[PDB]
Amino acid sequence: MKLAVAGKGGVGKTTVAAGLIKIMASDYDKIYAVDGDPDSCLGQTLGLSIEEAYAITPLIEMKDEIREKTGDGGLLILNPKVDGDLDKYGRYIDDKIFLIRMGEIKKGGSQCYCRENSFLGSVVSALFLDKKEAVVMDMGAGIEHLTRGTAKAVDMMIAVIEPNLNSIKTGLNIEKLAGDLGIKKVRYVINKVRNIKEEKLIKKHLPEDKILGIIPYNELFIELSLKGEEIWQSTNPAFVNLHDIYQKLRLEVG
């Protein structure tokens, strides 16, 4: 299973990705958790501490590796082979979850970032096209880390939105961008739902077959994230809705 989880900052899309990764850990022998959004920490929401997460160097900061992979002596290899080296680009959180952090994609007028972006790109391609392992990579609504090439392997793109008109169109633009890239399955996860009136608003704007499931708003996520305590423990009620969502997902992916 190769999953992409995207959403606007603040919708709780990093939280959703962590929950699915947490759930998948039992069903697969190994899983690559890919933090493709620098604005939130996938690792910490997965249980790691600030220190543990920070020690996991981002792809964008692996200067020697980037220089080595992109060549030198006049050489400029923007499509380096890196599949056999992925496990040297992150850490195992436990015996099943391997975390890789993409890092900030810079843009920025006056310089060349081709080699850097080329390295991040080969790793993403290696994760989706070469590796057998399951992969769950989160990203912002722009889903910039994906390309037509990798989009071939993405089993499903999960757009995470909130129950309001604005978030719904943000959700629709993700489905557009994903489609354009060639991703066949784009499904929705409504998060932070507080009432039925919101559920109805979602059902009128979204085909029901495109909806993976709903996750209610629970103050737990906040009072639980504020401290070193995994939020997807049996304690969390909304943890059921996640399981429901996970199963519906595995049914479509086959």
Ligand X SMILES: Nc1ncnc2c1ncn2[C@@H]1O[C@H](COP(=O)(O)OP(=O)(O)O)[C@@H](O)[C@H]1O
Edge-to-edge strand ranges of the sheet holding 31-36: 91-92, 97-101, 31-36, 134-139, 2-6, 156-161, 186-193, 211-216
- Report d(CA 199, CA 241) in Å as an integer: 14
Judge whether 37 and 43 are in contact, CB under 8 Å. no
Task: Please report, as residue ranges, which positions from 3 to 32 form the binding site for ligand X (by CB under 6 A).
Answer: 7, 9-15
Q: Judged by CB under 6 A, does residue 70 bind ligand X?
A: no
Q: Which residue in the set 225, 230, 243, 248 belongs to the binding site for ligand X (CB under 6 A)? A: 225
Q: Judged by CB under 6 A, does residue 44 bind ligand X?
A: no
The reply to whether 192 sits in an annotated binding site is yes
Q: Which amino acid is at 64?
A: D
Binding at 78: pick from Zn ion, ligand X, a second copy, none (beta carbon under 5-8 Å per type): a second copy
Binding at 13: pick from ligand X, a second copy, Zn ion, none (beta carbon under 5-8 Å per type): ligand X
Binding site for a second copy (CB under 8 A): 76, 78-79, 110-112, 114-115
E strands present in the chain:
2-6, 31-36, 91-92, 97-101, 134-139, 156-161, 186-193, 211-216
Binding site for Zn ion (CB under 5 A): 112, 114
The reply to whether 13 sits in an annotated binding site is yes
Nearest distance from residue 110's CB to a second copy, in Å? 6
Binding site as annotated, residues for Zn(2+) = 112, 114
